[PDB]
Amino acid sequence: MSLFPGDIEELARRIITDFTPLGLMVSTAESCTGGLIAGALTEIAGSSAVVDRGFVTYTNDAKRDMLGVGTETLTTFGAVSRQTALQMAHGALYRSRANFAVAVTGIAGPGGGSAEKPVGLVHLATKARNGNVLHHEMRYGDIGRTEIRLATVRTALEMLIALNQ
Amino acid sequence: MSLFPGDIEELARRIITDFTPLGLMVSTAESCTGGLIAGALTEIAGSSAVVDRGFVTYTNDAKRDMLGVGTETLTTFGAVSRQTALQMAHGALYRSRANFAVAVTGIAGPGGGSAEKPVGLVHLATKARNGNVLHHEMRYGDIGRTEIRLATVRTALEMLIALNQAG
Ligand SMILES: [Cl-]
Ligand SMILES: [Cl-]
Numbered sequence: 001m002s003l004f005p006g007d008i009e010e011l012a013r014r015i016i017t018d019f020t021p022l023g024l025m026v027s028t029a030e031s032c033t034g035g036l037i038a039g040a041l042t043e044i045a046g047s048s049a050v051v052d053r054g055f056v057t058y059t060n061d062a063k064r065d066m067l068g069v070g071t072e073t074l075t076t077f078g079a080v081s082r083q084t085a086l087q088m089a090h091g092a093l094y095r096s097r098a099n100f101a102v103a104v105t106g107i108a109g110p111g112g113g114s115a116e117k118p119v120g121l122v123h124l125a126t127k128a129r130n131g132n133v134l135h136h137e138m139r140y141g142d143i144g145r146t147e148i149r150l151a152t153v154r155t156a157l158e159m160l161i162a163l164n165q
Numbered sequence: 166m167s168l169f170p171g172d173i174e175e176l177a178r179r180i181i182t183d184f185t186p187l188g189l190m191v192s193t194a195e196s197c198t199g200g201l202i203a204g205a206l207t208e209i210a211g212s213s214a215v216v217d218r219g220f221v222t223y224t225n226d227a228k229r230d231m232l233g234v235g236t237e238t239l240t241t242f243g244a245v246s247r248q249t250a251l252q253m254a255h256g257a258l259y260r261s262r263a264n265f266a267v268a269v270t271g272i273a274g275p276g277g278g279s280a281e282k283p284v285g286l287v288h289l290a291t292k293a294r295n296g297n298v299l300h301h302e303m304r305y306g307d308i309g310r311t312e313i314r315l316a317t318v319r320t321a322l323e324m325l326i327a328l329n330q331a332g
Contacts (some may be wrong), residue, residue, distance in 0.1 A: 003169075003311055047199075053222055058216055
């Protein structure tokens with residue numbers, strides 16, 4: 001039984017396989033994927049060596065409380081912004097024992113879209129203790145709630161791999 | 166598009182459907198399922214009304230920091246125990262705005278099994294603000310890592326429903 005599609009499962013595999021000999025651990029912070037990024041990473045046998053913790057923070061209160069996202073960041077730029085994603089990744093990294101953190105915030109739909117922030121808009125950020133930061137703004141389109149969530153999982157994993165090189 | 170087994174999706178849908186008019190929210194604390202319980206609940210449109218937050222406490226450090234599980238519970242009873250499950254549920258509840266928390270700690274395998282704590286052993290606990298707690302020890306068997314994880318998600322969702330019925 002494999003829950004995730006093969007690209008996601010392979011990317012998760014590569015991360016566990018790569019990170020273990022390097023002694024590297026990961027933390028996740030999720031606000032649209034609902035735990036699926038941690039879920040995908042932990043599908044892999046041996047993932048206990050690598051996965052530290054995950055923060056599932058749909059609510060803006062949870063983003064502030066669990067990850068230290070600023071109240072004014074949220075009120076000025078919204079939950080779904082570059083600024084929020086960066087602060088989420090910073091919080092997930094420093095509030096964990098991980099070497100790398102990836103954070104995502106987006107609109108999976110069907111609800112919650114607008115001209116300015118459409119369904120499928122997702123901001124992703126990854127940060128390393130060495131200081132390296134990567135951010136991408138993705139606009140997946142109105143392609144379905146599960147579809148956007150899985151698209152986001154794949155991008156998050158790709159970013160962890162990239163960060164590591 | 167489906168991601169989880171139909172019956173798991175049905176259970177998640179029941180929780181979102183029931184809890185919304187009741188104004189109730191849930192938090193999850195996950196070791197062995199790695200976020201799939203929150204994942205399953207948030208497959209449902211409208212789940213944002215109900216799902217407050219989730220803790221994936223894959224390590225013992227995480228159980229301690231995020232949930233306040235005691236070092237004393239962990240070295241005496243183990244990460245996989247009724248006691249750890251109860252403390253996780255309590256921690257997830259009172260470190261959130263939820264009405265109910267569900268916590269799971271188990272051995273998905275393939276590794277880590279022993280006679281006393283075999284692969285497929287999972288402790289689940291749900292707690293409500295009024296103090297009501299439910300706990301189940303499951304022994305799903307050595308049936309595969311994804312299989313045990315999904316079996317755990319199912320039971321976790323069943324228990325949230327039961328805990329609500331009892332309130
Ligand atoms: Cl493992
Ligand atoms: Cl929703």
